[PDB]
Amino acid sequence: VGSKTKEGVVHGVATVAEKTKEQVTNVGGAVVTGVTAVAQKTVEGAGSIAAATGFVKK
Amino acid sequence: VGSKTKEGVVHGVATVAEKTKEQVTNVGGAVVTGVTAVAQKTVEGAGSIAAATGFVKK
Amino acid sequence: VGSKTKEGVVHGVATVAEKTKEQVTNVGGAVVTGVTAVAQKTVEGAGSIAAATGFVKK
Amino acid sequence: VGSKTKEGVVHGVATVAEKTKEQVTNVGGAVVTGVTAVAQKTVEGAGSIAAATGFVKK
Amino acid sequence: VGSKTKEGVVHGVATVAEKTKEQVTNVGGAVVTGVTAVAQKTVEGAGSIAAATGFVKK
Amino acid sequence: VGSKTKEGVVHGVATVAEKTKEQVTNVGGAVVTGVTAVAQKTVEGAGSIAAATGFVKK
Amino acid sequence: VGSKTKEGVVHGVATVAEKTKEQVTNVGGAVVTGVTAVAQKTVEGAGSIAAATGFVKK
Amino acid sequence: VGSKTKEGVVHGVATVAEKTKEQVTNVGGAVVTGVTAVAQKTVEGAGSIAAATGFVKK
Numbered sequence A, B, C, D, E, F, G, H: 001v002g003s004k005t006k007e008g009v010v011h012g013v014a015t016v017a018e019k020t021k022e023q024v025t026n027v028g029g030a031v032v033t034g035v036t037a038v039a040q041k042t043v044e045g046a047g048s049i050a051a052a053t054g055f056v057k058k
């Protein structure tokens, strides 16, 4: 019962970022800026890769 | 009972970002800016890759 | 019962960041800026790779 | 019952960061700036790789 | 008399070759197979980048 | 008389070769297989980057 | 008379070769297989970077 | 008369070769297999970086 399982895989990626200026200003919240070539696999779990989750209150 | 399973896979990607200026200003909330070549596979789970989830209140 | 399992894998990545200036200013919250070639696999667990999770209150 | 298990693996990565100036200013919160070629595998555990988790209060 | 001169330049390239098998058989001649991101600039010269130049005779 | 001269330049390149098998068989000639990120600048000269130049005779 | 001269330059390169098998068989000629990130600048000279130059005779 | 001269330069290179088997068989000729991050600058000279130059005769 031979079973192969290629899951949550990422291969053969090539990004090129040319940026003269890159700022992230944050006042009161969350920021999630740059993600590249990210992989995940959960079992009885909750995956949440890029989750900027803000709560401003008073 | 040989079963192959190629799931949640990402391969052969090539992005090129040329940006003279890139700003993200945040006041009170959330931001999720740049995601590229991201993969996921959950089992009994809730996947949520890029979720900027704000709550401004008073 | 020979089973192979290639899960949560990341291979063959090549990023190139050319940036003249890159600032992250943070006042009251969270920031998660640069992630590249990150992998994960949980079992009875909750994976959460890049999670800037802010709570501004009073 | 020969089972191979390549999980949470990261191989063949080559990043190149050219940055003339890179600042991270933090006032009251959290910051998580640069992650590259990071791998994880938990069993009965909660993986959380890059989690800038802020709580500003009064 | 300020003169800028961006000549013979190549920047921001990202190729991705996925090939299961790649053969080059040569019997009597020339072959020039793979060129990528190549640049040149001659002055009183003859540029000739990829020149497979065969002469079969008797 | 300030003159800048960016010539014969190559920057920001990222190739990714995934090849299961790659053979070059040569019998009587020339072969020039893999060139990547190559640069040149001659003055009173003849540039010739990849030149497989065969002469089969008798 | 301030003159800058960025010539024959190569910077910011990142190649990734994954090859299960790579053979070069040569019988009677020349072979030039793998060149990467090579730079040159001649003055009263003849540049010739990858030149497999065969002469089979009798 | 301040003149800067960045010529024949190579910087910021990162190659990664993963090869299960790599053979070069040579019978009667020349072979030039692996060159990476090579630089040159001649004045009244002839540069010739990778030149497999064969002469089979009788």
Ligand SMILES: Cc1cc(-c2ccc(/N=N/c3ccc4c(S(=O)(=O)O)cc(S(=O)(=O)O)c(N)c4c3O)c(C)c2)ccc1/N=N/c1ccc2c(S(=O)(=O)O)cc(S(=O)(=O)O)c(N)c2c1O
Residues within 6 Å of the ligand: A020, B020, B021, E004
């Ligand atoms: C993209 C880019 C931006 C800037 C630059 C310049 C100024 C600046 N802000 N300045 C401020 C700000 C505020 C001021 C304020 S306030 O806001 O009220 O507080 C007040 C006052 S005042 O009351 O005293 O009047 C000021 N004076 C303020 C002020 O001066 C900022 C933010 C940015 C400069 C240069 C620039 N880019 N340069 C170029 C220029 C050339 C580039 C060239 S080339 O040489 O032309 O071939 C090529 C290339 S490429 O090959 O890579 O494509 C480039 N990328 C080139 C390039 O990027």
Ligand SMILES: Cc1cc(-c2ccc(/N=N/c3ccc4c(S(=O)(=O)O)cc(S(=O)(=O)O)c(N)c4c3O)c(C)c2)ccc1/N=N/c1ccc2c(S(=O)(=O)O)cc(S(=O)(=O)O)c(N)c2c1O
Residues within 6 Å of the ligand: A020, C020, C021, E004, F004
């Ligand atoms: C990367 C880069 C940054 C900037 C730049 C310049 C200034 C600056 N802010 N300055 C400020 C700020 C505030 C001031 C204020 S305030 O706001 O009230 O506080 C007041 C006053 S005042 O009342 O006294 O008037 C000021 N004077 C203020 C002021 O001066 C900042 C923030 C940034 C300019 C240029 C620049 N890039 N340069 C170039 C320029 C050239 C580049 C060239 S080339 O030589 O042209 O060929 C090539 C290449 S490439 O090969 O890599 O493509 C480049 N990348 C080049 C390049 O990047």
Ligand SMILES: Cc1cc(-c2ccc(/N=N/c3ccc4c(S(=O)(=O)O)cc(S(=O)(=O)O)c(N)c4c3O)c(C)c2)ccc1/N=N/c1ccc2c(S(=O)(=O)O)cc(S(=O)(=O)O)c(N)c2c1O
Residues within 6 Å of the ligand: A025, A057, A058, C057, C058
């Ligand atoms: C950077 C920057 C910041 C602010 C700023 C400063 C103070 C401030 N006050 N905070 C308050 C105050 C009161 C609060 C009160 S109250 O008193 O009862 O009313 C209550 C409550 S509560 O109930 O929630 O408890 C609060 N939370 C209150 C509160 O948070 C706040 C809110 C903000 C403002 C402006 C600012 N400017 N940023 C700059 C500044 C400069 C920039 C420049 S320069 O070179 O300097 O010219 C250039 C450039 S660009 O050309 O590149 O785009 C920029 N983008 C620049 C830039 O972005």
Ligand SMILES: Cc1cc(-c2ccc(/N=N/c3ccc4c(S(=O)(=O)O)cc(S(=O)(=O)O)c(N)c4c3O)c(C)c2)ccc1/N=N/c1ccc2c(S(=O)(=O)O)cc(S(=O)(=O)O)c(N)c2c1O
Residues within 6 Å of the ligand: C057, C058, D058
């Ligand atoms: C950097 C910077 C910071 C701020 C700043 C300063 C103070 C400040 N005060 N905080 C307060 C105060 C009071 C609070 C009160 S109260 O007293 O009862 O009213 C109550 C309450 S509560 O009830 O919630 O408990 C609060 N939370 C209060 C509170 O949070 C805060 C909130 C913020 C403001 C501005 C600022 N400027 N930054 C600059 C400054 C300069 C920048 C320049 S330059 O070169 O210098 O020209 C350039 C550039 S750019 O071209 O590259 O974009 C910039 N972006 C620059 C820039 O961003």
Ligand SMILES: Cc1cc(-c2ccc(/N=N/c3ccc4c(S(=O)(=O)O)cc(S(=O)(=O)O)c(N)c4c3O)c(C)c2)ccc1/N=N/c1ccc2c(S(=O)(=O)O)cc(S(=O)(=O)O)c(N)c2c1O
Residues within 6 Å of the ligand: D025, D057, D058
């Ligand atoms: C760096 C920097 C800092 C601040 C700054 C300073 C003090 C300050 N005061 N704190 C307060 C005060 C009161 C609080 C009060 S209250 O009194 O009841 O109201 C209550 C409460 S509470 O209820 O929460 O307990 C608080 N937490 C309060 C509080 O935190 C705060 C909040 C902030 C401000 C500005 C600032 N500037 N930064 C600089 C400064 C300079 C920068 C320069 S320069 O070369 O110097 O020109 C250049 C450049 S760039 O060109 O490269 O972008 C910059 N970015 C520069 C830059 O970013």
Ligand SMILES: Cc1cc(-c2ccc(/N=N/c3ccc4c(S(=O)(=O)O)cc(S(=O)(=O)O)c(N)c4c3O)c(C)c2)ccc1/N=N/c1ccc2c(S(=O)(=O)O)cc(S(=O)(=O)O)c(N)c2c1O
Residues within 6 Å of the ligand: A004, B004, E020, F020, F021
């Ligand atoms: C020359 C030659 C080549 C091969 C052969 C077969 C398969 C193969 N690839 N294998 C696979 C397979 C699976 C892959 C999987 S999976 O399915 O999920 O697990 C995934 C992935 S991936 O994740 O990376 O996408 C892969 N890349 C996989 C993959 O590459 C490769 C690269 C090469 C096989 C044989 C071969 N030549 N054999 C010869 C050759 C000659 C033979 C000759 S003769 O000399 O020509 O007369 C005679 C005789 S006989 O008379 O005795 O019958 C023979 N038996 C001869 C003979 O056997």
Ligand SMILES: Cc1cc(-c2ccc(/N=N/c3ccc4c(S(=O)(=O)O)cc(S(=O)(=O)O)c(N)c4c3O)c(C)c2)ccc1/N=N/c1ccc2c(S(=O)(=O)O)cc(S(=O)(=O)O)c(N)c2c1O
Residues within 6 Å of the ligand: E025, E057, E058, F057, F058
């Ligand atoms: C690889 C291969 C080679 C040849 C082959 C062998 C000998 C040969 N003889 N040479 C002669 C002979 C005489 C000359 C004469 S004469 O005697 O007066 O007439 C004169 C003159 S002259 O006047 O110019 O001086 C000559 N030059 C003469 C000359 O050059 C020559 C010319 C060629 C033949 C076939 C051959 N097969 N190749 C293979 C062989 C096998 C291949 C296989 S397998 O696994 O092995 O089954 C598979 C596969 S694939 O499925 O992947 O496509 C392949 N492609 C395979 C493959 O390509």
Ligand SMILES: Cc1cc(-c2ccc(/N=N/c3ccc4c(S(=O)(=O)O)cc(S(=O)(=O)O)c(N)c4c3O)c(C)c2)ccc1/N=N/c1ccc2c(S(=O)(=O)O)cc(S(=O)(=O)O)c(N)c2c1O
Residues within 6 Å of the ligand: F057, F058, G058
């Ligand atoms: C590898 C291979 C080589 C040749 C081969 C062998 C001998 C040979 N003889 N040369 C001669 C001979 C005589 C000359 C004469 S004469 O005696 O007066 O007539 C005169 C003159 S002259 O007047 O010009 O001076 C000459 N030049 C002569 C000459 O050049 C030559 C030219 C070539 C032939 C075949 C060959 N087989 N290779 C194989 C063999 C096997 C291959 C296999 S396998 O696994 O083994 O099944 C598989 C595969 S694939 O599936 O991957 O494609 C292959 N491609 C395989 C493959 O390519």
Ligand SMILES: Cc1cc(-c2ccc(/N=N/c3ccc4c(S(=O)(=O)O)cc(S(=O)(=O)O)c(N)c4c3O)c(C)c2)ccc1/N=N/c1ccc2c(S(=O)(=O)O)cc(S(=O)(=O)O)c(N)c2c1O
Residues within 6 Å of the ligand: C004, D004, G020, H020, H021
């Ligand atoms: C020349 C030759 C080569 C090989 C051979 C077979 C497999 C192989 N690779 N192995 C694997 C396998 C698994 C990998 C796995 S896994 O599955 O998850 O565990 C993972 C990974 S990864 O993580 O790095 O991606 C791998 N890289 C794995 C991998 O590389 C390599 C590199 C090479 C085998 C044999 C061989 N030649 N053998 C010959 C060769 C010739 C033989 C000849 S003859 O001279 O040609 O006439 C005759 C005869 S006979 O008459 O007695 O039958 C023979 N038996 C001959 C013979 O046996």
Ligand SMILES: Cc1cc(-c2ccc(/N=N/c3ccc4c(S(=O)(=O)O)cc(S(=O)(=O)O)c(N)c4c3O)c(C)c2)ccc1/N=N/c1ccc2c(S(=O)(=O)O)cc(S(=O)(=O)O)c(N)c2c1O
Residues within 6 Å of the ligand: G025, G057, G058, H057, H058
């Ligand atoms: C490797 C290999 C070699 C040859 C081979 C052997 C001898 C040979 N004879 N030479 C001659 C002879 C006579 C000359 C004459 S004459 O006598 O007057 O006619 C004249 C003249 S002259 O006038 O120029 O002076 C000459 N030059 C002559 C000449 O050069 C020559 C020419 C060639 C042949 C085949 C060969 N096979 N190679 C193999 C062999 C095996 C391969 C195998 S295996 O595992 O072993 O099954 C597998 C595989 S693969 O699956 O991975 O593709 C392969 N590719 C294999 C492979 O490539």
Ligand SMILES: Cc1cc(-c2ccc(/N=N/c3ccc4c(S(=O)(=O)O)cc(S(=O)(=O)O)c(N)c4c3O)c(C)c2)ccc1/N=N/c1ccc2c(S(=O)(=O)O)cc(S(=O)(=O)O)c(N)c2c1O
Residues within 6 Å of the ligand: H057, H058
């Ligand atoms: C390794 C190998 C070598 C040769 C081979 C052997 C002898 C030979 N003889 N040379 C001659 C002879 C006579 C000359 C004469 S004459 O006597 O008057 O006729 C005249 C003249 S002249 O007038 O020009 O002066 C000459 N030049 C002559 C000449 O050059 C030559 C030329 C070549 C042949 C085959 C060979 N086999 N190699 C193998 C062998 C095995 C390979 C195997 S295995 O595991 O062993 O199965 C596998 C594999 S693979 O799967 O990985 O591809 C392989 N590729 C293998 C492989 O390549």
